[model samples]
Target: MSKVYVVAAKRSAIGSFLGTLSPLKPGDLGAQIVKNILEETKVDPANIDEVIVGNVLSAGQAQGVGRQVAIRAGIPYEVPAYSVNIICGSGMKSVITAFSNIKAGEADLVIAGGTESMSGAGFILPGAIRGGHKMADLTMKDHMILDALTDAYHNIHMGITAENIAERYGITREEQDAFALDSQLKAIAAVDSGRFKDEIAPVVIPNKGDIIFDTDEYPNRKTDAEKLAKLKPAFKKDGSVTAGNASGLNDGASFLMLASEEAVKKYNLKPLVEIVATGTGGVDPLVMGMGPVPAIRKAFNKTDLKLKDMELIELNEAFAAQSLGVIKELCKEHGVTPEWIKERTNVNGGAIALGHPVGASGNRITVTLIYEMKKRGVEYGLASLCIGGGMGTALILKNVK
Candidate 1:
């Protein structure tokens, strides 16, 4: 069996929707990071065997984004490209696909990641006919709003699902707000301490002179308990989930250069990490927030590793309530202390503060975990996320020098 090694990983600094990243299309953002990855790793563009990009809300600039991004990034015309969407887990799934290909002796070198431009999701008219027979309101629908908030099977909003999880897990608004505050503080610290410097490639717009999009533009440095306490719930009137505790709408892109052991040696690549195991699980759509628990357990089942073996964890903070619920459940089941889980999880903040570009978050969290693991000299780390529609994905990585 061939081993898949990570040669390089890079992501654009995340920007709030309609914020700093609005000027760039999702494909363009992906292309910039892809180009940077090749340059930084000194890998020839023509050497890549395939490109897979994860994306949701595939409209406007995001439609057929994979091929466009590959071409824009100067990947050879002969290299095949694909676009994948598994809701929020799309990006991680792309990497998993590449890993499978390499491990199966199908391909040696691949570029896999995710990109999303929430601000450019645009609008859709659905089934409007051409004869103006039913032009009655033109019914313009915002894809970002409809695609993210609504779950077709459950027929409820994601925020409402968060509310249900909070109710079930007995998580309080105060606890949720406190966790959110911690996320913001940690993210601010990571930014101020330059923890993300090497992982982020600046998004530069050629048309805008002297304008460079560098820093993540979402964390609220001034967030305090008083502000969070006064805020009303975003879903149900009496719900615990609030705007402050939920992930912000955002836009971003990430890319990872992966190669088999043979290719790694041939290219003289210094592998930073290797994928040890991957898992995906499905759960009741109503309680989708608990998805990561099953996914992580499945990964452990496959690798014969336990939660206690993870030196670091990157659990995407889609909502404070859900994250808290998952952590508590994992601790109870594994007989690990809550304090220990807190110490290891999201040490550099998470989607709550950094923002969640749904399609890009899976790749973003894995990239963050790998870089942080290298910095701290950690051996095993886990990156996991709960999908939007009753699914969870987990990936375990072993740090390599």
Candidate 2:
């Protein structure tokens, strides 16, 4: 199969759930993103083959969000769009799907991304509709029975999985705190360095009552370790993982335009990065956040490259524990030395300091890695994220043109 290249990618400035993005519908946010992408690359909507969008919740008017956004963005009537939801990995998986289509020659150009409005998600849900079951049971929070079984099987509630990893790897709380601090510091540095400018499409909030654009009004430029360390644990009382270290639930949309090399010339487009490989794997669901270890392994195994071969890596810091866990495992199992992995991994701050928009995180990581690689003068990169249902996604990319 031909290489799948990412031609253009962009994302809205992440919004703290129920915060900056509350006024905008998820579909509308995604649509605005589509419009911005077209503006950024001057790519015509007529030539696009498909728009694959992902999100965790599709409530109210945002139902079938991908199609809605495609239409709202003024994409050609012949250009079809679809939605994909794989929990936290939804957005990233959408990009992977688009890449697959391009590699298979099934599509010439596609726009793929994820959007979610957690503010809208907390109370109003689909299953609450007529003839619908409890949405929480199936979507956000797994059924109690399933949760119990997952815990029994993995002996943890995602957060405790960090403890499992910490114990196994002898990662201390101080170390985790330090790692979390590193993320905050690194993120501060990246933002100061303006590395996020290309990746973040300043969002515009359109409202009948108020109109806005080009900035998220809620970000704090002065985040510190002391503030992070004060937060309490989330899953377990004694658990080392806390709000300070875990990914913040946020609202955002991320999109990647994927096309084959033939399509690139046909459209007179410059390709940004090519999908080298995509490897996804499932682990024990209860410890779902740790899924990246095996997923990365799977991706590496499929290619001749070792961990050291990647010039940069974007490991979604779903939690400091899980992030450190993957790093430790890579060192021990693959002989990927810490110096090499640390230098190559998450050069930008991770979700711990940034944000994790669940369904959007995968693509968010993918797009950010490409831009970071370009800024740092790198050639190869990887964007890896952990899924909620015991699965993970890993994408390898190369600057093809």
Candidate 3:
């Protein structure tokens, strides 16, 4: 099997719901990272075998977004493009598919990632009449909220699941708030230090013209424990889960340019990181937040690697309670303390402070992890995230530069 390498990776600055990125369609956001990477790497569009995009909200402006983004990125029409919808795991799944294609000797070069524009993820009014129904019976629903908040099979909201984990793990509101505070502080420092500049590409919003969005709009630099404590519970009446401790609705895109060993030598490419291993796992939908524990275990199950081997780790901060639960459980399984996991995980903050753009976050975290790993000169790194339904994705990467 040929080794697959990540040659280039980039992401658009994350935007809050209807924030800086909402003006553009999801396809447009995805195209920006694609165009930036191609221009930066000077990789020929013709040599690319395929483009795979991950997206959750496939309605409104994002319909056929995969093909739309591929063409908009200036790739040749002959190259096939497709989209994957694994909920939050979509982005990482795309990268894994690209890696498999290269390892299987099917393709040499591929572009893969995810994008989402929650602002443009419009609502629908099914069974509501345009001409025949009375106003009294008319009803409308927000698909974005519906898809984001609901757990289809379990018939419960995601927040309720977070509260469930909090209950199961004995995670307190104070603990959750402290974690959230730490996330915000770390993200603020990262932004202030310009640590994310290298990985984020500036995006220009169309029709609005001349305005360039270069910074993430979600991190609350002014956040304090006092402010977080004042916020009310968003889920249950007395639940520990609150808006301050959960990831927000966001919009963004991320892409990684992957090449096979043959293509790397052919194009004289300088690989930044090599794909080492990948894994996915499933858990009970009622406790979906614990998905990463089994996912990370599966990632290392086939290899001799251990938790201590990873110098850096990026775990999606879907909710502070769940994030803590996963870390504690994984640490227990590895015979390590929670402190060890905390020190190595999301050192630059996570989805709690950085924002989670659903489909885009999987790729976004991976890109962020690799870049940070390279900066820190780490030998091995891990990137993982929980999916909406009951699944999780994990990937092991080695710094090869």
Candidate 4:
């Protein structure tokens, strides 16, 4: 079997919800990294076998965003491009598909990543079911938005689920609040210390034909826990999982370059990371974000590596409640964490601080984990997330060179 290594990974600065990045279309933003990878690695656009894009909202100008990005980035028309939508798990699935294809000897070079532009877009997308019926469904229904239906199916809204776990496990609201503060501070530090420089491609803002990439666009550098505590609960009347603890909706794009070992050597390329294992699972859809338990457990089973051996973790913080639940379950049920996860997992911060752009988040986290692991010289890492409709997606990766 050939090893599939990650040749390059890059993403734009994460934007606040309907903020700085709203002006850029998902395709245009996505193509920036594609162009960056081609230029940085000196990899020919014509040599890429395929470009698989994961996007959640595929309406308006974002329709066929994969093909649109590929064309805009100057990849050959003959090179196949398609979009994948598994809700929040879409981006991770795209990478897994690329990994499987290369391992199966079906392809050589692939560009797998995700993009999203949530600004000025609605949830429902027009699709034909069974080829004859137009269905108005695009993004998955938010579980909190349909708690009654989820309750009927033995599921609960994320906040309620977290509340249940909090009461059961005796986790204090103050603890979650403190964790949120740490994440914000860590993100600010990561940007300031230049930890993200190797991974983030500086996005240039053109002023009507003027040439200049923009600055670090999203880092506010000042956050107040008191201010966060004052924000109202987003889901429930007295919910603790406020926007302070949960990931905010935002716009961003991430791209990964995948290549077979032979292809890497043929191109005289040095890959920074290699994917060792990949896994996916389904759980109760109501607390959909808790899907990481089964997924990471599956990864542990494949690699025969205990949780202690994991040097770093990128557990997607969909909400503080969902993330903490997964962590507790992994530690109590299957022995996942014993020490400080806040210090180990998402050391540079996660969805809570970066803002989760659904389809783009998984790959973005994967790339972020790679950057963190390589910086710390960590040998093993895991990037995982919960999907809508009761699914979990995970990818195990390692530093190569």
Candidate 5:
């Protein structure tokens, strides 16, 4: 009977691949953010009903990272916890799962989010280490490439899908680079103007000289249109999708402390937004990047919310071409113009510049959306992501503050 509300939220500043955040494993990194959430809300850890964390590449990380994170952050072992893996959609799925649990009267307060450390991902040594199949020259697959980036179904790199999306939409290399440049510019502007000051939590990397890595490390301030254009393609020999326009390998964690209306009043917690509706769409692995179109439509259709009416659209920039494809398709379906797309979509920048830490991104987008909506005084926002394999996920949020 009570609507679920996001009482408190925060995301660690994203680290470059195997860079600043490599020092800590996924559970340890997530625990830090979870602790910060508790401190901000002053919510007693024991009162939490459950903890769920999404982590796609749990290869070498601690077992049951969700529960590991909860316990390490001071939540009592009495509270139930688990982890999820829906690839890039894991984070949003975790929240939606928590949303359902609370709405179904199963729990009054729950913690849900995601964490990832590409740096912590280890190689997959095929076969038993001491077995006969394991020869002295056995090649170990890079977990970062095999488990994380490649679409197992199609057996191709994610960049191939971006290329396909670009080809499908006739998006050119220059256009993609320009789009990436815009995303970078927006991110730089956002960082300079303190737009992200409230959203990003400083991650203290004890191993890295105990440095407090407070700011994002991916956005290249010196990047220019020419610089992005000069880069070679990453996926295919003749393809337009290049490293400059695609989301990079990154590491980070994000979390949102959610509560039912009863819990909110009891704990004296202020809420940010209310989770509204969500939708998921399917597609082939070849063109998975454009999955957001149908998902966005279906989600908006559920609530009588017109796509054009939303004040903000936080579509993940999984790749520049992929984002353009989604924008093109969405604009055509909604009867909107390119001008509108430029004005409303990813106003503060996106994954192309900020980097996509897969599981964390779905929650990352949501956290950024909520804060950006409040700053812009917008009432509605859409958070959506193109899952790696063949599906798209979208979540709608209504600002209640």
Candidate 6:
């Protein structure tokens, strides 16, 4: 079997909902980052075996979303491309899909990533084409919320699930707020220090000539406990989850160039890391945040890598309470402390402050993880994310150098 390697990674600077990237479609956003990846990797376009993108809201976006990016990114026309939708897990799953293709000796090179634009998701008319013998005002549904934010089975918003996790775990609003503050502070620090410059490709806002969005727009540079305290609970009346503690609607895309050992040798590619093990787990949708708990457990068991041995960890911040719940589960099950987890987890901040662009988050975390791993010469690293509807994805990467 051929070993898979991560050759290149790139992502657009995340934009807040209806912010700079709102006007552009998701695949278009992804294409920009894909172009940058090609520029950085300089791999032959002809050898690209496939292109797979994770996308949640394809309702108002391009036809054959990943195919659009592949063509725009200059991949050969013969290469097949497609999109994956597993909610927040979509991005990471796309990478796993590419990895499986390479490992199975079916592909020598693949472009795998994710893209989403919450702002661009159009309002959809449900059952409006043919009236069902009812006379009522037009009630268009928000495709973004309907398709991505709501749990179809539970018929509830994702934030409400965070409320359930908070109540069950005894996590509080103030603590979640504090956690969000830390995320904001850390994110601001990272941006100020230009720590993310290496991983973020400048996003040019559509129709804004000579203007570029080079930094993530979601971090509140002046956020404080007082400000967070002013925010009302966004879900349940007495819920701990607030807008301040949860990931905001955003737009962004991320892509990685992956190659098999043979392809790497032939193209003279420099791979940063290789996936040692991957894991996925399912849990009750009510406590979807626990998704990462089982996923990480499975990966650790497969690789014999302890959480303490991991140089860095990235668990996407869907909501502060949700993240804290996952952390508590990790502590209880793996015997790790909050301090230890905080010390090494998401030192570059998280989606709470960086913006969660749905499908882009998984790739965003992996790109951030691998880049940081290279900078620090990390040997073992882990990336995980809780899906929207009761699932989790995790993967462990080992530096090949």
Q: Can you give the TM-score per candidate against the true fold?
A: 0.97, 0.88, 0.97, 0.88, 0.97, 0.97
Q: Between candidates 3 and 6, which one is better according to TM-score?
A: 6
Q: Residues 112-196, candidate 4, lDDT per residue (tens digit)?
A: 9998866534443225433664455455454223421134355555556556555655666666777677777877788778788
Q: Write the residue-wise lDDT of candidate 5 on 1-401 in tens digits.
A: 67889998899998899889988889999999999998888888989999999888888765788888898899998999889988888888899888889989999999999999988889887767665672368788998888778998889999999999988879999999999999999998988888998988888888525789878888978889888989999999989998899988999999998899999999898899988888888888899898888788888888978887788888999899999888888888998887787798889899988889988898999899989998988898999998878888888989996
The residue ranges of model 5 lying beyond 4 angstroms of the native Cα positions read 128-131, 134-136
lDDT of each: 0.90, 0.77, 0.90, 0.77, 0.88, 0.89
Model 1 misplaced regions, further than 4 Å = 128-136, 208-210
lDDT of 1 at 166: 93
Candidate 4 pairs with clashing backbones: 204-213, 204-214
Q: Write candidate 6's Cα lDDT for 1-401 as tens digits.
A: 88789999899999999998987888788988998888787777888899999999998564888898888878878988899999998899999889889989889999999999999999988765675746768788899998999988998999988998998989988889989999999889888998999999987765737468889989988779998999888988867788899999999999888899999899999888998878889999988888998889888897667888888999999999999999998988878899999889999999999999998899999999998898899799999999988999998999988
lDDT of 6 at 210: 46
Candidate 2 lDDT by residue in tens digits, 290-390 = 78878888988878887777899999987888888778777888786877888777787888877777667788888889998877777889888877667
Q: For candidate 1, lDDT tens digit of each residue in 218-337? A: 999887999999998898877889999999999999989999998998989889999998889888889888899999988888787888999999999989998998998999888899
For model 1, the run of ten residues with the poorest summed lDDT:
128-137
Q: Give me the runs in candidate 3 sitting further than 4 Å from their true place.
A: 127-136
lDDT of 2 at 347: 82
- Roughly what TM-score does model 5 have, to 2 decimal places? 0.97
Cα lDDT, model 2, residue 85: 76
Position 393, candidate 1: lDDT: 92
- Per-residue lDDT, model 6, residue 312, is 94
Off by over 4 Å in 2: 124-157, 208-227
Model 5: lowest-lDDT 10 consecutive positions? 127-136
The backbone clash count of each candidate, in order, is 0, 2, 0, 2, 0, 0
lDDT of 5: 0.88
